[PDB]
């Protein structure tokens, strides 16, 4: 902050004004600026080039837009609103990609089932009519003061209706529409970067959501896309108007003139800086020509929303904020969009260590989502309780969604633990017969200034694990300064993996013999052999379970849905192993260890 305050002063050639200080505190906060993670992120193999980030072609006609986000900070302060708006936020991300939101896969890490967090997710999900197709839940006392709420959202989008994420020429205007702007979430970006949860950020920082408006938002926006009206888009989240407008024009190397007086307000006595920095929910920024702006506003207002043309895209790369004829702030756009970059730590992996059994706790979110009329994975090819969510795109087309993490391991060795989490994400995907296509990741870390190695260790293994598996990063999020009184959370990388699968080829469980396929321990040089064995057996029609516990309660519960009973003698396994459970009529034949352990019947 201080080091940053002094650079701004360098750059500005004076001290900032009140407005500029609120502005850069937002844009230059770890949350918005990614100071510590920008360089590590660049080294990541990405689905980048592919015009649009988070967008992955499925069959040359349809693509899957997906991304995982977090709302850890706010969820610790206000479980309900923080968790709810957590989903509201990531949903708007997939919508801005041009895709109709279709699925939500949550990844929760708490010291116990925090009602408010589970209910904020269920209510908001139910009101927007977007199903939760799965959920990863980890309970550990290590997340007591900093629960982790990571939400993955995915959507189907036509390859010929991809929306851009930037402004492209002088003369375009930017429309802000959706719910009216208020004071909520003001400074939440900085609140979410606060080296500590017990810092000067509180209730004035958490956003309030309203799914009814969000529902209206997707309808309005998709109709805008379908009418060739949207030439660019970016949802309003952290930093609100400021963040959306500056980045949109920043990405296109253009500038902008913002008219805050044009921002539909919910609270008319707000000051100009509050309008600029407000983080009110359910809002979207649209880049377009002056001609299409009328139809856009017509559509927005017709869907019971509010909106007006707020900014003009200019050639000069300056960010000029006006309020009527008053000049509120004026700074170089690229100054605001390029927070100071931190040098990184070169991390060289050590010997794979022997992991100790770190007692954690899992639980089928479905069993916990009933209390709040929220069904998990009711419309999927096969139950997500078996390891992966499989959704239908077409009769003979589909995709899978997987959310995995291994903080229990990473806590002992961030590199290997983290790297293992991803490989295991590959096993899950392959196990349902899906082909790994891309990853969306959420980096949840502590304080990078106090511990730079742990971050590097996490980011470098994501790189290596992507290189090893050949599965690139399509999108993602970084959440740092996830601490309390300095007490850091366990380094948790959440891997969201997208796979391609034909709904017709997905196996269902039925009476069969059970075999433990693989090794009881881990060696990087045989992982691909395990994948090969899984690919072969899946092709032959085998049902396959890939779990750290080999067989979980959720599993036993899911088999119940088929009236099937499982009786086996689980092999002794280490915290990190390379073994999968295979169900078939005959003994599996692969070049990997095979042991018959029991049966599935009734
Ligand atoms: O509603 C929009 N959500 C989008 C968004 O950008 N939200 C911002 O992220 C913070 C949580 O970050 P974390 O503690 O999870 O790292 C939250 O407080 C918002 O400022």
The verdict on the CB of residue 72 being under 6 Å from ligand 1 is: yes
Three-state secondary structure call for residue 602: coil
Query: Residue 235: is it exposed, middle or buried by C-beta count within 10 angstroms (0-12/13-18/19+)?
Result: buried
Catalytic residues: 31, 71
The verdict on the CB of residue 138 being under 6 Å from ligand 1 is: no
Give the position, in ligand 1's atom list, of the atom nearest the Cα of 236: 2
Residue entry with tokens 């992507």: 466
The beta strand positions in 492-531, using DSSP E, are 492-500, 512-519
Ligand 1 center–CA 187 separation, angstroms: 10
Determine how β-strand 100-110 pairs with β-strand 132-139. parallel
- Binding-site members for ATP are 34, 67, 106, 135-138, 387, 428, 441, 476, 548, 555
Ligand 1 center–CA 568 separation, angstroms: 45
- 227 Cβ partners below 8 Å, 6+ apart? 295, 299
8-state DSSP, 526: G
Instruction: For the chain, give the longest Cα–Cα distance.
Output: 79
Instruction: Of 42, 118, 159, give the one whose Cα is nearest residue 478.
Output: 42
Residue 238 contacts residue 141 (beta carbons within 8 Å): no
The verdict on the CB of residue 303 being under 6 Å from ligand 1 is: no
The verdict on the CB of residue 444 being under 6 Å from ligand 1 is: no
Ligand 1 center–CA 189 separation, angstroms: 6
Residue 317 contacts residue 262 (beta carbons within 8 Å): no
- Binding-site members are 34, 67, 69-73, 92-93, 106, 135-138, 188, 207, 235, 279-281, 387, 428, 441, 476-477, 479, 548, 555
The verdict on the CB of residue 211 being under 6 Å from ligand 1 is: no
Residue whose CB lies within 8 A of the most ligand 1 atoms, among 279, 280, 281, 481, for a mutation test? 279
- 22 Cβ partners below 8 Å, 6+ apart? 187, 273, 276, 277
- 1-34+162-339 and 507-602 agree in CATH topology: no
Residue whose CB lies within 8 A of the most ligand 1 atoms, among 237, 455, 476, 480, for a mutation test? 237
Give the position, in ligand 1's atom list, of the atom nearest the Cα of 70: 15
Instruction: Of 172, 487, 413, 192, give the one whose Cα is nearest residue 315.
Output: 172
| CATH ID of 1-34+162-339, from 3.40.720.10, 3.40.1670.10, 3.90.650.10, 1.10.3370.10 | 3.90.650.10
What is the token pair recorded at 160? 């010929």
* Other beta carbons less than 10 A from residue 87's beta carbon: 30
**Domain definitions of the chain by residue range:** 1-34+162-339, 35-161, 364-506, 507-602
Question: In which region does residue 568 sit, left (phi positive, over 0), alpha (psi from -120 to 50) or beta (all else)?
Answer: beta
Q: How distant, in Å, are the alpha carbons of 181, 270, 278, 391, 475 from that of 267?
A: 7, 6, 11, 42, 35
**Strand arrangement, sheet containing 232-235:** 232-235, 283-288, 173-178, 306-314, 255-259, 318-323, 326-332
The verdict on the CB of residue 425 being under 6 Å from ligand 1 is: no
Ligand 1 center–CA 296 separation, angstroms: 27
CA distance 532 to 544: 13
The verdict on the CB of residue 207 being under 6 Å from ligand 1 is: yes
- 134 Cβ partners below 8 Å, 6+ apart? 105, 106, 365, 376, 377, 380, 384, 388, 389, 401, 402, 403
Q: How distant, in Å, are the alpha carbons of 4, 334, 387, 534, 586 from that of 568?
A: 59, 61, 19, 20, 16
Ligand 1 center–CA 86 separation, angstroms: 7
- Binding-site members for substrate are 70-73, 92, 188, 207, 279-281, 479
Instruction: Of 432, 436, 437, 435, give the one whose Cα is nearest residue 541.
Output: 432
CA distance 307 to 413: 49
Continuous segment of H or E residues that includes residue 326: strand 326-332
Q: Which resolution in angstroms does this entry have?
A: 2.3
Three-state secondary structure call for residue 79: helix
| CATH ID of 507-602, from 3.40.50.410, 3.20.190.10, 3.30.70.1670, 2.60.40.10 | 3.30.70.1670
The verdict on the CB of residue 187 being under 6 Å from ligand 1 is: no
What is the token pair recorded at 10? 């360098």
The verdict on the CB of residue 237 being under 6 Å from ligand 1 is: yes
Ligand 1 center–CA 445 separation, angstroms: 14
DSSP per residue over 234-297, as a string?
A: EE-BTBHHHHHHHHHHHHTT-EEEEEGGGS-BSSTT--HHHHHH---SSEEEEEE-TTTHHHHH
The answer as to CATH 3.30.1330.10 being correct for domain 35-161 is yes
Three-state secondary structure call for residue 73: helix
Residue nearest to atom 8 of ligand 1 (CA): 238
Continuous segment of H or E residues that includes residue 350: none
Give the position, in ligand 1's atom list, of the atom nearest the Cα of 207: 1
Residue entry with tokens 């995907």: 429
The verdict on the CB of residue 31 being under 6 Å from ligand 1 is: yes
Give the position, in ligand 1's atom list, of the atom nearest the Cα of 88: 1
Ligand 1 center–CA 85 separation, angstroms: 8
The stretches of 293-370 forming alpha helices (DSSP H) are 293-302, 333-337, 365-369
Task: Name the architecture of domain 364-506.
Answer: 2-Layer Sandwich (3.30)
The verdict on the CB of residue 243 being under 6 Å from ligand 1 is: no
Instruction: Of 190, 185, 135, give the one whose Cα is nearest residue 5.
Output: 190
Continuous segment of H or E residues that includes residue 589: none
Continuous segment of H or E residues that includes residue 330: strand 326-332
- 172 Cβ partners below 8 Å, 6+ apart? 231, 232, 287, 288, 289, 313
CA torsion sign for 445, 204, 27, 86 is positive
Ligand 1 center–CA 424 separation, angstroms: 28
Residue entry with tokens 């039925």: 510
- Binding-site members for Mg(2+) are 69, 93, 235, 477
Return contacts of 546-551, CB within 8 angstroms, 24+ apart. 546/387, 546/424, 546/427, 546/428, 546/430, 546/431, 546/580, 546/581, 547/387, 547/581, 548/406, 548/424, 548/575, 548/577, 549/362, 550/516, 550/579, 550/581, 551/581
The stretches of 399-448 forming alpha helices (DSSP H) are 407-410, 414-431
Tell me the CB-side half-sphere exposure of residue 269, using CA atoms within 13 A.
Answer: 0
DSSP per residue over 141-205, as a string?
A: GGGSSS-EEEEEEEEEEETTSPPPSS--SBTBEEEEEESPB-STTTTHHHHTT-SSTTSS--TTT
């Amino acid at each position: 902050k201080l080091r940053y305050l002094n650079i701004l002063k360098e750059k500005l050639g004076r001290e900032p004004t009140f407005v500029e200080l609120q502005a850069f505190s937002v844009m230059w906060s770890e949350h918005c600026g990614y100071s510590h993670t920008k360089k590590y992120i660049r080294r990541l193999p990405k689905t980048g080039f592919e015009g649009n980030a988070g967008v992955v072609n499925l069959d040359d006609y349809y693509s899957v837009a997906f991304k995982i986000e977090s709302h850890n900070h706010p969820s610790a302060i206000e479980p309900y609103n923080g968790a709810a708006t957590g989903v509201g936020g990531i949903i708007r991300d997939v919508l801005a990609m041009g895709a109709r939101p279709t699925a939500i896969f949550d990844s929760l890490h708490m010291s116990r089932i925090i009602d408010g967090i589970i209910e904020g997710i269920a209510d908001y999900g139910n009101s927007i009519g977007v199903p939760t197709v799965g959920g990863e839940l980890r309970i550990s006392s290590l997340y007591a003061h900093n629960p982790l709420v990571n939400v993955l959202a995915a959507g189907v989008v036509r390859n010929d209706m991809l929306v851009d994420s930037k402004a492209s020429r002088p003369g375009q205007v930017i429309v802000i529409f959706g719910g009216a702007t208020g004071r909520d979430g003001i400074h939440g970006a900085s609140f979410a970067s606060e080296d500590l949860t017990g810092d000067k950020a509180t209730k004035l920082s958490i956003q309030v959501g309203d799914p009814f408006a969000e529902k209206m938002l997707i309808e309005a926006f998709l109709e805008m896309v379908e009418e060739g009206l949207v030439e660019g888009a970016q949802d309003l989240g952290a930093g609100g108007v400021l963040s959306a407008t500056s980045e949109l024009v920043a990405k296109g190397n253009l500038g902008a003139i913002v008219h805050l007086d044009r921002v539909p307000l919910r609270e008319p006595d707000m000051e100009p800086w509050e309008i600029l920095i407000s983080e009110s929910q359910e809002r979207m920024a649209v880049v377009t020509s002056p001609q299409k702006a009328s139809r856009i506003l017509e559509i927005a207002r017709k869907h019971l929303l509010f909106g007006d043309v707020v900014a003009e895209v200019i050639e000069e790369p300056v960010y000029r904020v006006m309020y009527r004829n008053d000049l509120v702030m004026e700074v170089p756009v690229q100054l605001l969009a390029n927070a100071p970059e931190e040098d990184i730590v070169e991390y060289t992996p050590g010997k794979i260590p022997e992991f100790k059994r770190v007692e954690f706790e899992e639980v089928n979110a479905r069993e916990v989502f009933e209390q709040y009329d929220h069904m998990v994975g009711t419309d999927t090819v096969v139950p997500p309780g078996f390891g992966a969510a499989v959704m239908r795109i077409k009769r003979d087309g589909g995709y899978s969604l997987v959310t995995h993490s291994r903080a229990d391991l990473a806590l002992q060795d961030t590199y290997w633990g983290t790297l293992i989490a991803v490989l295991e994400s590959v096993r899950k995907t392959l196990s349902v017969g899906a082909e790994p296509l891309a990853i969306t990741n959420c980096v949840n870390y502590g304080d990078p200034d106090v511990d730079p190695v742990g971050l590097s260790a996490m980011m470098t293994a994501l790189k290596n694990a992507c290189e090893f598996s050949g599965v690139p990063v399509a999108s993602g999020n970084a959440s740092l300064y996830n601490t309390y009184q300095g007490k850091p959370i366990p380094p948790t990388l959440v891997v969201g993996m997208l796979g391609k699968v034909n709904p017709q080829k997905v196996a269902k469980p039925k009476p069969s013999k059970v075999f433990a396929v693989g090794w009881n321990d881990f060696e990087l040089e045989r992982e691909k052999e395990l994948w090969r064995a899984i690919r072969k057996l899946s092709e032959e029609g085998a049902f396959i379970l890939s779990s750290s516990q080999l067989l979980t309660r959720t599993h036993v519960e899911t088999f119940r849905e088929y009236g099937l009973k499982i009786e086996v003698k689980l092999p002794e396994v280490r915290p990190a192993h390379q073994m999968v459970l295979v169900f078939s009529e005959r003994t599996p034949v692969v070049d990997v260890p095979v042991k018959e352990i029991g049966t599935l019947s009734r």
